[PDB]
Design an enzyme around this catalytic site. Structure first.
Site, mmCIF file in Angstrom:
data_model
loop_
_atom_site.group_PDB
_atom_site.id
_atom_site.type_symbol
_atom_site.label_atom_id
_atom_site.label_comp_id
_atom_site.label_asym_id
_atom_site.label_seq_id
_atom_site.Cartn_x
_atom_site.Cartn_y
_atom_site.Cartn_z
ATOM 1 N N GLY A 147 0.487 -1.092 -0.014
ATOM 2 C CA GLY A 147 -0.132 -0.002 -0.059
ATOM 3 C C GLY A 147 0.775 1.255 0.045
ATOM 4 O O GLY A 147 2.157 1.348 0.117
ATOM 5 N N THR A 148 0.081 2.413 0.031
ATOM 6 C CA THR A 148 0.646 3.749 -0.148
ATOM 7 C C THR A 148 1.507 4.141 1.404
ATOM 8 O O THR A 148 0.894 3.493 2.382
ATOM 9 C CB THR A 148 -0.326 4.817 -0.641
ATOM 10 O OG1 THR A 148 -1.232 4.853 0.348
ATOM 11 C CG2 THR A 148 -0.789 4.690 -1.819
ATOM 12 N N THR A 149 2.102 4.878 1.399
ATOM 13 C CA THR A 149 2.682 5.206 2.787
ATOM 14 C C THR A 149 1.723 6.327 3.631
ATOM 15 O O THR A 149 1.326 7.008 3.123
ATOM 16 C CB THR A 149 4.050 6.130 2.661
ATOM 17 O OG1 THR A 149 5.084 5.341 1.545
ATOM 18 C CG2 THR A 149 4.938 6.288 4.029
#
Ligand SMILES: [Cl-]
Lengths: 240, 195, 235, 250, 244, 231, 243, 241, 111
Positions: free
Chosen positions: G29-31
C-alpha cells in the site's frame, strides 16, 4: 446446521450424486407395473438369498398410500420408507384441506417434488429410490400408472419396470404389450406381469409378489398358491 | 351444537346427536350431522363452541386414518379414546384451547364388545354404559338409570333412546330439531334414517 | 473440494457454466414472436414407446397471458413455474391487473443466483417465457440459470439449438403471420430431432391477445404437420 | 465466525476402524499408570503423581477426584480432558438425578452418564474424542461396592480389579495372581501399593502417590450432626502420612 | 474454510453404495456373534461376549442383551456406546406409545422407529452412522412372537432365525440346516448354543463368555415373561445341553 | 493457484485471487463511459446483444430522482447493488427528508462489497459500476470496483476496450469540465469518448444507451430513437 | 506443508502464515504516518494520483472516529473502512454507557481485540491493513499503530506502507533531535516533509498530500483536517527540503 | 495430513496444533520468573524495546486482572491481550455472582478449562500463550498458578517461563534445595524483588538496567506493577552488596 | 394508560366528473378545543395523476400517504416506469391498510 452442497454440477454438466442414486436403483430388486383396461397390476421381485425369513412380518414391497393408491419401489429400502411416510401424510392432508382424495397424478407430483428437493438442498443426499405409483382417481375408471426417479422427473406409463435387469423385462414388455388392445381382464394383466418377471426372477416360488388394484379402492395381494398357478400355466404353454 | 347422547347395549353402541345449528337468533340448519367416522368400527360425536368442534373432529379423523394406512390395522376403541383424551388434555393448557366435548362409540373386534367413552374438553375420560354432555344428562340419566340393562338388544336401546329424546323435547327450553341416530356394531356403522 | 459460488480465473461462476452444459443435453424447445402472437414448440423425446407421451408436460401455462417452455433438467423447472404462477397471481391480487411479461421473467430470474453454502446449486434448466401485455405487446424471453434474461424475436434452446438458431436467423422477419410461425417451428424441430416428427413426439402452443395461452391438440398439430409436408413438396 | 464444523471428525475407515478413537486409546497408553481393586468391604483407586517440575506443588493437582460422597474417579491419559469430565460428571449427577430423586446416583448410572458424554464427542460435529480412560469406584445401597472402566469410545465395563495406562499389561497380570473374593479393604490397599511400585521409576512415597478408597461411612467428615440417616461420605482420600505407614508394612 | 476437513459421511459411491454404511458393517463383522431363534412357544436370544478377563465382574455386566420394555428385548452387535444411545431412545418411544394409546407398542412399530433414526444419519446431517446392528426379540397380540434385525443403513427385515456380528455366514448356514417350523423353545435354546459353539473363535464356549435370554409364554397363563439368564443359569444350561 | 479456491485466502504475495477473478468479469463486459461538468453528469453505455433476434441488454439503472448508475459485468449483481442503493437513497428521504449524498452512496457500496471479500461461503460481486448524481455539492461521478474500492472522478470508463475512452477523456479534461448549462454538448463529448473504444461495430439506434442528471434535470435514460439525435 | 492455506492454523514454527501474507498487502500500500507532538497528534498519508481524471482533494483517506480520534491506514482500503466502522460502533457504545468519550488506550484495545478475533477462525480472513490512529483524551496525547495480527503498541512516531523504512528513519531523527518535544504546527510541517521524502519509493506517479491533526491548543482536542493556507505552507516547507 | 492443521488426534495420540502453540509461546524471546515471599508474591519479566519510535510505557506483558490477581504472559501480545480481557471479565463476573473475590487458582482453572476446549473443538484455535497468575490469596496465602495451551495448570513454589526457562528453573531448584522451605524467608517485598532479580541475573548471566526489566508485586488485598524508578532503587540495593 | 390514537379533526370531499375529478379538504388541524394550525395541507399530489387524503388521526394519515407515495416510486422501479392506474393504486392501498388490521391506521382515506 450442516449446509454442505453434496449435489453439484460437474464440468460436463452432470450431477453425479443424482446419477449415483440411479445406480442404487439399478442394484435394487426388480419392480414392474402393467395397466390393463380396468385394472393395474404391480409385480415385485424377492431375492431368494434370504431364506429363514418371516414373510408375515417382513416389510412388503408394495405399500398403500391411501385406500385407492399404491406405491412400489426399487433401490434403498430405508430411503423408500421416508417417501412413503411423507406421501401418506400428504394424502390425509389433501383430504383434510380439499375434501377430495388425491389423484394419482397429484400424489406422484408430490413424491417427485420431494425427490427433486433433495437434489438441490444443502446437507442432504438424493433418495436412492425410483417408484411406481398406481391407482384410480376418485369416481374414475381409467387406470393410472406413473414412475418417479431420484432426479425428480416423473411421467405416465402404459407399462414400466425399474430395478435390476429392468432393461430385459422392459424389452419383453415393449414387444408383448399392445396399446390398441391392453390386457382386457385381470387374468390377462396378471399373466403378462408374471411372464415379464419370469424373464429375470429365477424360481417362480416365493420370489414373485403380485398386487392387483381395481377401481373404487379395490386392492388385493395374491398369495403364493395363486401366483404359483400362473407360473405353472405359463411354462406348460411354453413347452411347445 | 348442544345435544349428544350415547348408549352401549349388548352388541352395539348407539349415538344420538341433535340436528340444529344456530347463528344469532336464527336457526341456520336443521339437518346437521355432528359426527365423524374415525375408523370402520369407531364413531365420534361432538359438541362445543362453533368451528372448534368440526376442526377438532376432522383433525382426529385424519390422524386415525393415517395410523390405519401406516399399520394396515384398526386401532381399538380404547386406544383411539386415549389418543383423543391426550389431544384434549394437551389442548386445555394451550394459548387458545379447543372447546369440544366428545362421545366415542366403537366395537372392539378383538374382544367382541361394544364400548362407549365420554370425554369432555378438559380431557376427562370415562368408560360408561350410557353417557351425555352438557345439560343432556340432567334430563335423561334418571330414565337410563331406571330402564338400562347390559343385555339389552339394539331395538330395546333405540326405544329407551326415544324415551330420552321425548323427555328432552318436553322439558328443554331449546328446540334442537330432533336427532340423527347411528349404530356401531360388528358390521360397522349405519344410520337409522327414520327417527 | 471447492466453493459452490467460486469464480474461475476467466471471471465466470463454475457452477453456472456447468449448468449450461446440462441444458445443452436437454430436448429442443423453440419460440417465435410475431405481431399476431408468439408460438412455443418442444421436442417431447420419450425414452420408450410404452411411455404415454401426452404425460410429458414441457410446455406450461403461467397465466392466461403468459406461457412457458423448458429444456434441460425439467424437474428443476417445477419450483420455478410454481414461483412464476404465484408471482403472476399475487401481482393481480395487489394491483388488480395483469403483470408485465418482463416483470414476471425478472421475478423468476431472481431465484437463479440464490445458491450457496438458499438452495445448494443453480437450476439445471433454461426457460422460454412467452406472453403479451398492453405496454410492450407480444414478447419472448430466454431465462437462464445465470440470472440473465434476453428478449428475442425468435429463440431455440436445448441440444439442437445452434443449428436451429442459424435457421431462425434466416427465416424470421417482422411481417410473419401466426400460421407462418407455426409451420416454421415445426420445420426447424423436424430438422434437429433424432426421431421423425409427428403429433405424438412434438407439441405446439401459442399466446394471443384474444384467446390467451393455448396448448395445441394432437389433432390440430397433425394437420399443421400435413400442411408443412405438402408445402415443402410444392417446390 | 459461527462453528461451521457441523460434520463428524471421527469416521469409519474402509477396514471398519474409527481412527480417532484408536488414536485416543494410544494417548491413554502413553499416560501414567492408574489402577483399581475391589474388596469385600471397599474399593481402592490409585495412581502416580507424576510431577512436571519439582518447583510445582503437586498437592494442588488432584488426579483422584470425588464425584459424589460415595463415588470417586481416577484416570490415565490427558489431564485437562479428565478435569473437564469431572466438572461435567459432578454437574450431571445433580441435574439428571439428585434434583429429580433427592439422592445421589448409583455408581453404574453415573458411569452411564459420563460414558454418554464421551460417546457424543465421538459422533457429534466439530469435536475430537476425549483422550482419557477413567476408572470409577463407588458404593450404593442396592448394588454394594463397584468398580468401572470408561474408554474414549464411551464403552464401560465392570471390574473386580484392573489397571490402565503405561504399564497396564504387566499390572493386570500382577492383579490376577493376587486377587480373590475374600479380600478385606486393607489387603486391597496393600496389593494396590505393591502393584503400583512396579510401574514407578523414581521416588515411591506418600507425596508421589495419590490413593483413595470407597469404604465405611465417615461421620467425622460429614460436617454436621443431628440427622441419624445421614452418616457421612464413603469416599476418602488417604493422606501422605497414611500411605507411608502402610509402606513400612510392605 | 471448514469444507477442507469434511469427510462427507452421507454420499454415494460411483457404484451406488453408502461408503460409511458399508464400513460400519465391516466394523460390526468383528463384534461378538449374537443369535436369535423364534419358536412356536417363545424366542431365544444368545450372544457371545468378546475376549473377556477373569477379573471382569460378570454378574453385574451387560454388553449384549438389553431390555426395551416388558415385551421386547434386543441383542447388540457393534459399538456398545452407540447402541446405548439408541436403546434409551427406543425405551422412550415405547413409553410415549403406551402413554398415548394406553397399549404396549407393537414390535414392528418400535423397530421401524429405530431404523428410521439410523436411516437419517445416512442421508443428512453430515455425521457418522451408528456402528450397531440389533436383533429385536419381542411379542405383541397381533403377530405374536417376532424376530427382526436392523443395521446402520436403517434397513430392517423379519426372521425365523438370524445371526449378527462375526461369522454370520457360517452361523446362518448352520441355522438354516437344523431349523424347523414346529420347533419349541427348549430345542431352540439347544440350537442357539450349538451354533455359537461351532462358530466361536474361542477355544471353548464357557458360561463366562455368554449372555443369554428367553421370551416365553411360559408365564402363568396368557402373558409373556422375559428371562435374562444369570451366570449360574447359563452354566446349568451348558451342562444340560451337553457342551461342557 | 493454491490460494484462489475461496475469498477468505490471501496468496503469499498478499493478493486475493477470487477478487481479482471478479475484476476480470468486468473487463469481459461491454464498454460504458461516465463524465461530468459542473452543472450536469452523463452516462453513455454501449449495450450488447446475444444475436440479431435478441434485444440489447440494458446497462443503465435509475436509483433515485437525483442518482443512478451504469453497469459492466454480471448484470444480476448490478441488480442487487442497485436495489441496495435504491433502498439507501429511500431510507435517507423517508427518515431524514434528505437526498442521499453521492459520496455517502459510494461509501455504502464500498462497505457492502467488502463484507463479501472477508467471509467464508460467500463470493465477491462480479460487476463494476459508474454512479452519477447531482446533490447539494453539485454534479458527481463515481467508479465502483467489487474489491470495495470506490473513486470520485471527473470522467472514466470501464469494460472491454475502456482504455481508449479513458485516454480521450484524459486529453479532453479541460474542455468537457467547462461544458456548463449545455446538456447536448456534454452528451456529444461522452458519445465521442465511447467511440474511441469501438472496433468493427458502430453506434446504432438500438445499440446506444445514454443517461443524464443535472441542476434542473432529473435522472432520465434515453434509448431508441431518442438517441438518434446523437448518432 | 499446507499450513499457509488456512487462517488460524499454527505452522510448525508457531506462526500464522495467513496473517503474515496479510502483512504483504499492507507493505504493498501507499505510505501513511503518525507523529506524536507536545499536546496532540498529527496524521499524514500519500495519495497516488493514478490519473488526471481524479478530482483533487475529493477522495479522502483519513477518517475520524467519534470527534477526538483520527485513523489512517495502508493496504486494502475497504478493510480499513470496515475497521473504522467497527471503531465508531465501539466508541458509540462506550460513550452511551459511560458518558465520557472513549479514551485512546481503551479505543486501541477495542480495535485490537476485533482484529485479533479475525486470526482465531478459518471462516474469516485477517485484515489487510496496518492502522495508525490516536488523539487527545483526559490523560493527554496518544499515538498507536495496529497490525493485521492484532498487535499494537503506543508510539512517539509511526509509519507503514511501501515507504515505511524511509519514513521510520526520518521519525527517528526527530525523536533524537527533540527530546523536550515537538509543537503541533512543527509536526504538521515535519509530517509533510516525511511523506514527500517517503514518496521516492512511489516515484513513478505523482501524488497528493493529505494531513490531519488533534491538538489541545490548536484544535481544542478535536480531530480536524489541515486545509488551505496551513496545508500550502506545509507543502512549501516540504518542497523546499527535498530541493 | 489434515490431522496437523486442526485439533484432532494423530496416529501417535498427539495434538500437533497444541504442540505448535507451545512454540509460538517463545516468539517474543522474553523470559519471566515468579517467586513467593512470606507476605507477598513477586513476578519479574524481561522488557525489550527494540524500536526507538515505540512509546516504552505502553510495552508490557504484565496485566492487572483484578485488584488481588496479577498475570504475566509468555507469548505474542494479541493472544496475551485476548487472554487478559477474558480473565478480567471472568474475575468480575465471579465477584458479582458469588459475592467474594475470585481466587488465583480458581481463575487459573477457569482459563485452563477454556484452553482445554480449544484443544477439543476444531473451529477454535489454541492461544499461543502461557499465563502465569499471581496473588496473595486470603485462604492459601502467596500463590503462583500457571496455564498453558494444552489446558494444563498447577500451583508452584516458584516458576520460570521463556526460551531460557530451564536455566532459571535449575537456579531456583538449587536455592530451595539449600533452604529446604517453599518460599523466600523475607519480611518486605522489596527484598523479595531483589532476590528475584538477582537470581535471574545469575541464571541468564546478563546485567539489567531499569528499562530492561518489568516487575509485578502481589500483597494482601492488592497487586501492583513497579515503575522504572522503583526498579532503579531495587537495582542500586543489589549492586551495593 | 397510554392512548396511541388521537383526533385531528378535518373534513375531506371527493367528486368525480365526466372527464375530471376533484379532491378537496379544509386546512384546519386541531386537538380537542385548540387549533394547531390554520393551514396544514391534507390533500397531496402522489404522482401518476393521483391525489390522496387520509383524514382522521394525522400521524397515521401522514404515515399512510408517505407509504403509498413510496409504493408509487417502487412500482416505477419494478415495472419499467409503468403508470400506476387509479384502480391499481386503490387495490394497493387496501393491502397497506389491512396490514394493520389488528392495529389500524385510524384514518378515513379518499383518492
Ligand atoms: Cl469452567
Amino acid at each position: 446446521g450442516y449446509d454442505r452442497a453434496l449435489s453439484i454440477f460437474s464440468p460436463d454438466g452432470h450431477i453425479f450424486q443424482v446419477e449415483y442414486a440411479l445406480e442404487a436403483v439399478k442394484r435394487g430388486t426388480c419392480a414392474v407395473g402393467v395397466k390393463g383396461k380396468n385394472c393395474v397390476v404391480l409385480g415385485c421381485e424377492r431375492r431368494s438369498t434370504l431364506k429363514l425369513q418371516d414373510t408375515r412380518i417382513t416389510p412388503s414391497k408394495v405399500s398403500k398410500i391411501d385406500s385407492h393408491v399404491v406405491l412400489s419401489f426399487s433401490g434403498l429400502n430405508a430411503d423408500s420408507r421416508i417417501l412413503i411416510e411423507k406421501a401418506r401424510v400428504e394424502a390425509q392432508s389433501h383430504r383434510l384441506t380439499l375434501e377430495d382424495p388425491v389423484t394419482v397424478e397429484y400424489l406422484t407430483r408430490y413424491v417427485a417434488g420431494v425427490q427433486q428437493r433433495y437434489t438441490q438442498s444443502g446437507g442432504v443426499r438424493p433418495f436412492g429410490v425410483s417408484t411406481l405409483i398406481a391407482g384410480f382417481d376418485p369416481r374414475d375408471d381409467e387406470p393410472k400408472l406413473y414412475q418417479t426417479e431420484p432426479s425428480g422427473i416423473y411421467s405416465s406409463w402404459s407399462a414400466q419396470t425399474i430395478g435390476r435387469n429392468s432393461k430385459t423385462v422392459r424389452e419383453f414388455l415393449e414387444k408383448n404389450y399392445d396399446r390398441k388392445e391392453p390386457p382386457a381382464t385381470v387374468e390377462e394383466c396378471v399373466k403378462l406381469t408374471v411372464r415379464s418377471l419370469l424373464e429375470v426372477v429365477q424360481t417362480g416360488a416365493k420370489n414373485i409378489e403380485i398386487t392387483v388394484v381395481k377401481p373404487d379402492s379395490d386392492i388385493v395381494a395374491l398369495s403364493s398358491e395363486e401366483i404359483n398357478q400362473y407360473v405353472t400355466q405359463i411354462e406348460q404353454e411354453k413347452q411347445e | 351444537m348442544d345435544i349428544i347422547l350415547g348408549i352401549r347395549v349388548q352388541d352395539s353402541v348407539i349415538l344420538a346427536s341433535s340436528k340444529a345449528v344456530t347463528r344469532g337468533i336464527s336457526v341456520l340448519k336443521d339437518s346437521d350431522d355432528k359426527t365423524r367416522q374415525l375408523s370402520p368400527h369407531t364413531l365420534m360425536s361432538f359438541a362445543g363452541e362453533a368451528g372448534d368442534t368440526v376442526q377438532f373432529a376432522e383433525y382426529i379423523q385424519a390422524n386415525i386414518q393415517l395410523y390405519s394406512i401406516r399399520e394396515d390395522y384398526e386401532l381399538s376403541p380404547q386406544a383411539v379414546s386415549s389418543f383423543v383424551r391426550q389431544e384434549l388434555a394437551k389442548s386445555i393448557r394451550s394459548r387458545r384451547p379447543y372447546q369440544v366435548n366428545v362421545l366415542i362409540g366403537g366395537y372392539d373386534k378383538k374382544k367382541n364388545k361394544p364400548e362407549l367413552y365420554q370425554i369432555d374438553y378438559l380431557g376427562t375420560k370415562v368408560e360408561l354404559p350410557y353417557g351425555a354432555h352438557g345439560y343432556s344428562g340432567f334430563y335423561t340419566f334418571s330414565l337410563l338409570d331406571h330402564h338400562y340393562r347390559p343385555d339389552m338388544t339394539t331395538e330395546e336401546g333405540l326405544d329407551l333412546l326415544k324415551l330420552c329424546v321425548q323427555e328432552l323435547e318436553k322439558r328443554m327450553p331449546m328446540d334442537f330439531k330432533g336427532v340423527i341416530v347411528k349404530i356401531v356394531d360388528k358390521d360397522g356403522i349405519r344410520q337409522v334414517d327414520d327417527f | 473440494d471447492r466453493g459452490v459460488s467460486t469464480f474461475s480465473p476467466e471471471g465466470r461462476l463454475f457452477q453456472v457454466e456447468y449448468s449450461l452444459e446440462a441444458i445443452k443435453l436437454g430436448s429442443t424447445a423453440i419460440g417465435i414472436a410475431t405481431k399476431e402472437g408468439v408460438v412455443l414448440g418442444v421436442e417431447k423425446r420419450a425414452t420408450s414407446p410404452l411411455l404415454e407421451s401426452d404425460s410429458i408436460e414441457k410446455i406450461v401455462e403461467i397465466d392466461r397471458h403468459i406461457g412457458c417452455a423448458m429444456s434441460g433438467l425439467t424437474a428443476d423447472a417445477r419450483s420455478m413455474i410454481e414461483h412464476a404462477r404465484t408471482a403472476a397471481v399475487t401481482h393481480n391480487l395487489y394491483y388488480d391487473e395483469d403483470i408485465n411479461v418482463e416483470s414476471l421473467t425478472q421475478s423468476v430470474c431472481d431465484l437463479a443466483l440464490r445458491f450457496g453454502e438458499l438452495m445448494s446449486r443453480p437450476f439445471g434448466v433454461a426457460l422460454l417465457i412467452a406472453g403479451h401485455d398492453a405496454d410492450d405487446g407480444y414478447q419472448l424471453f430466454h431465462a437462464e440459470p445465470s440470472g440473465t434474461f434476453y428478449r428475442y424475436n425468435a429463440k431455440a434452446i436445448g441440444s439442437g439449438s445452434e443449428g436451429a438458431q442459424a435457421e431462425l436467423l434466416n427465416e424470421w422477419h417482422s411481417s410473419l403471420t401466426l400460421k407462418e410461425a407455426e409451420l416454421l417451428v415445426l420445420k426447424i424441430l423436424k430438422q434437429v430431432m433424432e426421431e421423425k416428427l409427428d403429433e405424438n413426439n412434438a407439441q405446439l402452443s401459442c399466446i394471443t391477445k384474444q384467446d390467451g395461452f393455448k396448448i395445441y391438440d394432437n389433432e390440430k398439430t397433425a394437420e399443421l404437420i400435413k400442411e408443412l409436408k405438402e408445402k415443402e413438396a410444392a417446390e | 465466525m459461527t462453528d461451521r464444523y457441523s460434520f463428524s471428525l471421527t469416521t469409519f475407515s474402509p477396514s471398519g476402524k474409527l481412527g480417532q478413537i484408536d488414536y485416543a486409546l494410544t494417548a491413554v497408553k502413553q499416560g501414567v499408570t492408574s489402577l483399581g481393586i475391589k474388596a469385600t468391604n471397599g474399593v481402592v483407586i490409585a495412581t502416580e503423581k507424576k510431577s512436571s517440575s519439582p518447583l510445582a506443588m503437586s498437592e494442588t493437582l488432584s488426579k483422584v477426584s470425588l464425584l459424589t460422597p460415595d463415588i470417586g474417579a481416577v484416570y490415565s491419559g490427558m489431564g485437562p480432558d479428565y478435569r473437564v469430565l469431572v466438572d461435567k460428571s459432578r454437574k450431571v449427577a445433580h441435574t439428571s438425578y439428585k434434583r429429580i430423586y433427592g439422592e445421589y446416583p448409583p455408581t453404574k448410572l453415573l458411569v452411564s452418564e459420563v460414558a454418554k458424554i464421551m460417546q457424543e464427542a465421538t459422533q457429534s460435529g466439530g469435536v475430537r474424542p476425549f483422550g482419557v480412560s477413567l476408572l470409577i469406584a463407588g458404593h450404593d445401597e442396592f448394588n454394594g461396592f463397584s468398580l468401572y472402566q470408561v474408554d474414549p469410545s464411551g464403552s464401560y465395563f465392570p471390574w473386580k480389579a484392573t489397571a490402565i495406562g503405561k504399564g497396564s499389561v504387566a499390572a493386570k497380570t500382577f492383579l490376577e495372581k493376587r486377587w480373590n473374593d475374600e479380600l478385606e479393604l486393607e489387603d486391597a490397599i496393600h496389593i494396590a501399593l505393591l502393584t503400583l511400585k512396579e510401574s514407578v521409576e523414581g521416588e515411591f512415597n506418600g507425596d508421589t502417590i495419590e490413593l483413595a478408597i470407597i469404604g465405611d461411612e465417615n461421620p467425622d467428615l460429614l460436617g454436621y450432626t443431628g440427622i441419624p440417616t445421614d452418616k457421612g461420605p464413603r469416599f476418602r482420600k488417604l493422606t501422605s502420612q497414611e500411605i507411608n505407614d502402610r509402606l513400612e508394612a510392605l | 474454510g471448514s469444507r477442507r476437513y469434511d469427510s462427507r459421511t452421507t454420499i454415494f459411491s460411483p457404484e451406488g453404495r453408502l461408503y460409511q454404511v458399508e464400513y460400519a458393517l465391516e466394523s460390526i463383522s468383528h463384534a461378538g456373534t449374537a443369535i436369535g431363534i423364534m419358536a412356536s412357544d417363545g424366542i431365544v436370544l444368545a450372544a457371545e461376549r468378546k475376549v473377556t478377563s477373569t477379573l471382569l465382574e460378570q454378574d453385574t455386566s451387560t454388553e449384549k442383551l438389553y431390555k426395551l420394555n416388558d415385551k421386547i428385548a434386543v441383542a447388540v452387535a457393534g459399538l456398545t456406546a452407540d447402541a446405548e444411545i439408541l436403546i434409551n431412545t427406543a425405551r422412550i418411544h415405547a413409553q410415549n406409545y403406551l402413554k398415548t394409546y394406553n397399549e404396549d407398542i407393537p414390535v414392528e412399530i418400535l423397530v421401524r422407529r429405530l431404523s428410521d433414526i439410523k436411516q437419517g444419519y445416512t442421508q443428512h446431517g453430515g455425521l457418522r452412522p451408528f456402528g450397531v446392528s440389533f436383533i429385536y426379540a419381542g411379542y405383541d397380540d397381533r403377530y405374536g412372537y417376532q424376530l427382526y434385525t436392523s443395521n446402520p443403513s436403517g434397513n430392517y427385515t423379519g426372521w425365523k432365525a438370524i445371526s449378527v456380528g462375526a461369522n454370520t455366514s457360517a452361523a446362518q448356514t448352520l441355522l438354516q440346516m437344523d431349523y424347523k417350523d414346529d420347533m419349541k423353545v427348549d430345542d431352540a435354546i439347544e440350537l442357539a448354543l450349538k451354533t455359537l459353539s461351532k462358530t466361536t473363535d474361542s477355544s471353548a464356549l464357557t458360561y463366562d463368555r455368554l449372555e443369554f435370554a428367553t421370551i416365553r409364554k411360559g408365564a402363568n397363563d396368557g402373558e409373556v415373561y422375559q428371562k435374562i439368564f444369570k451366570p449360574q443359569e447359563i452354566k446349568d444350561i451348558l451342562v444340560k445341553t451337553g457342551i461342557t | 493457484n493454491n490460494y484462489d479456491g475461496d475469498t477468505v485466502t490471501f496468496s503469499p504475495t498478499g493478493r486475493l485471487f477470487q477478487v481479482e477473478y471478479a475484476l476480470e468479469a468486468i473487463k469481459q463486459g461491454s464498454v460504458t463511459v461516465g463524465l461530468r461538468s459542473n452543472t450536469h453528469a452523463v452516462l453513455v453505455a454501449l449495450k450488447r446483444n446475444a444475436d440479431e433476434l435478441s434485444s440489447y441488454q440494458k446497462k443503465i439503472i435509475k436509483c433515485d430522482e437525483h442518482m443512478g448508475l451504469s453497469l459492466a459485468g454480471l448484470a444480476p449483481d448490478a441488480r442487487v447493488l442497485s436495489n441496495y442503493l435504491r433502498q439507501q437513497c429511500n431510507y435517507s428521504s423517508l427518515v431524514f427528508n434528505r437526498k442521499l449524498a453521492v459520496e455517502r452512496a459510494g461509501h455504502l457500496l464500498c462497505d457492502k462489497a467488502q463484507k463479501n471479500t472477508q467471509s467464508y461461503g460467500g463470493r465477491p460481486y462480479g460487476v463494476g459500476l459508474l454512479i452519477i448524481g447531482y446533490d447539494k455539492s453539485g454534479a458527481h461521478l463515481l467508479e465502483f470496483q467489487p474489491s470495495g474500492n470506490v473513486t470520485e472522478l471527473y470522467g472514466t470508463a470501464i469494460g472491454a476496450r475502456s482504455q481508449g475512452a479513458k485516454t480521450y477523456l484524459e486529453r479532453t479534461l479541460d474542455t468537457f469540465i467547462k461544458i456548463d448549462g449545455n446538456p447536448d454538448e456534454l452528451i456529444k463529448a461522452g458519445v465521442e469518448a465511447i467511440s474511441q473504444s469501438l472496433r468493427d461495430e458502430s453506434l446504432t439506434v438500438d445499440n446506444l444507451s445514454i443517461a443524464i442528471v443535472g441542476k434542473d434535470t432529473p435522472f432520465t435514460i434515453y434509448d431508441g430513437e431518442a438517441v438518434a439525435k446523437y448518432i | 506443508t499446507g499450513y499457509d492455506l488456512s487462517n488460524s492454523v499454527f505452522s510448525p514454527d508457531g506462526r500464522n502464515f495467513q496473517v503474515e501474507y496479510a502483512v504483504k498487502a499492507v507493505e504493498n500500500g501507499t505510505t501513511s504516518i503518525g507523529i506524536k507532538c507536545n499536546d496532540g497528534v498529527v496524521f499524514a498519508v500519500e495519495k497516488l494520483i493514478t490519473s488526471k481524471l481524479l478530482v483533487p482533494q475529493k477522495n479522502v483517506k483519513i477518517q475520524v472516529v467519534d470527534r477526538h480520534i483520527g485513523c489512517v491506514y495502508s493496504g486494502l482500503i475497504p478493510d480499513g473502512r470496515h475497521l473504522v466502522n467497527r471503531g465508531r460502533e465501539e466508541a458509540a457504545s462506550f460513550k452511551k454507557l459511560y458518558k465520557t468519550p472513549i479514551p485512546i488506550p481503551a479505543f486501541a484495545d477495542r480495535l485490537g481485540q476485533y482484529v485479533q478475533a479475525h486470526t482465531l477462525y478459518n471462516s474469516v480472513r485477517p485484515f489487510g491493513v496496518s492502522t495508525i490512529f490516536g488523539g487527545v483524551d483526559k490523560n493527554g496525547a496518544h499515538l498507536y499503530m495496529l497490525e493485521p495480527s492484532g498487535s499494537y503498541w503506543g508510539y512517539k512516531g509511526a509509519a507503514t506502507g511501501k515507504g515505511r523504512q524511509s519514513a521510520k528513519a526520518e521519525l527517528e531523527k526527530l525523536v533524537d533531535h527533540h527530546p523536550e518535544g515537538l509543537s503541533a504546527r512543527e509536526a504538521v510541517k515535519q509530517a509533510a516533509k516525511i511523506i514527500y521524502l517517503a514518496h521516492e519509493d512511489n516515484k513513478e506517479k505523482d501524488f497528493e498530500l493529505e494531513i490531519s491533526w488533534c491538538s489541545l491548543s490548536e484544535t481544542n482536542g478535536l480531530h480536524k483536517f489541515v486545509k488551505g493556507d496551513l496545508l500550502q505552507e506545509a507543502i512549501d516547507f516540504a518542497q523546499k527540503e527535498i530541493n | 495430513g489434515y490431522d496437523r492443521h486442526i485439533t484432532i488426534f494423530s496416529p501417535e495420540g498427539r495434538l500437533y496444533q497444541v504442540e505448535y502453540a507451545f512454540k509460538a509461546t517463545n516468539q517474543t524471546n522474553i523470559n519471566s520468573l515468579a517467586v513467593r515471599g512470606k507476605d507477598c508474591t513477586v513476578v519479574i519479566s524481561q522488557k525489550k524495546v527494540p524500536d526507538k519510535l515505540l512509546d516504552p510505557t505502553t510495552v508490557s506483558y504484565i496485566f492487572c486482572i483484578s485488584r488481588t490477581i496479577g498475570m504475566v504472559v509468555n507469548g505474542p501480545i494479541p493472544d496475551a491481550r485476548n487472554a487478559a480481557l477474558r480473565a478480567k471479565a471472568e474475575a468480575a463476573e465471579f465477584r458479582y455472582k458469588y459475592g467474594y473475590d475470585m481466587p488465583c487458582d480458581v481463575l487459573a482453572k477457569r482459563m485452563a478449562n477454556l484452553s482445554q476446549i480449544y484443544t477439543q473443538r476444531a473451529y477454535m484455535r489454541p492461544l499461543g500463550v502461557i499465563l502465569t497468575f499471581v496473588s496473595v490469596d486470603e485462604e492459601l496465602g502467596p500463590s503462583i498458578y500457571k496455564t498453558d495451551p494444552a489446558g494444563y495448570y498447577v500451583g508452584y513454589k516458584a516458576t520460570a517461563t521463556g526460551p531460557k526457562q530451564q536455566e532459571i528453573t535449575t537456579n531456583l531448584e538449587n536455592h530451595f534445595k539449600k533452604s529446604k522451605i517453599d518460599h523466600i524467608n523475607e519480611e518486605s517485598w522489596e527484598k523479595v524483588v531483589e532476590f528475584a532479580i538477582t537470581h535471574m541475573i545469575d541464571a541468564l548471566g546478563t546485567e539489567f538496567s531499569k528499562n530492561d526489566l518489568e516487575v509485578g508485586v502481589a500483597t494482601k488485598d492488592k497487586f501492583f506493577t513497579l515503575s522504572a524508578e522503583n526498579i532503579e532503587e531495587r537495582l542500586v540495593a543489589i549492586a551495593e552488596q | 394508560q397510554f392512548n396511541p390514537y388521537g383526533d385531528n379533526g378535518g373534513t375531506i370531499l371527493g367528486i368525480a366528473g365526466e372527464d375530471f375529478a376533484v379532491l378537496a379538504g379544509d386546512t384546519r388541524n386541531i386537538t380537542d378545543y385548540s387549533i394547531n394550525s390554520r393551514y396544514e395541507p391534507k390533500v397531496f399530489d402522489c404522482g401518476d395523476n393521483i391525489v390522496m387524503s387520509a383524514n382522521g388521526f394525522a400521524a397515521d394519515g401522514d404515515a399512510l400517504v408517505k407509504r403509498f407515495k413510496n409504493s408509487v416510486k417502487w412500482y416505477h422501479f419494478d415495472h419499467n416506469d409503468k403508470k400506476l392506474s387509479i384502480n391499481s393504486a386503490a387495490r394497493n392501498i387496501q393491502h397497506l391498510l389491512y396490514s394493520r388490521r389488528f392495529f389500524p391506521y385510524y384514518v378515513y382515506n379518499i383518492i
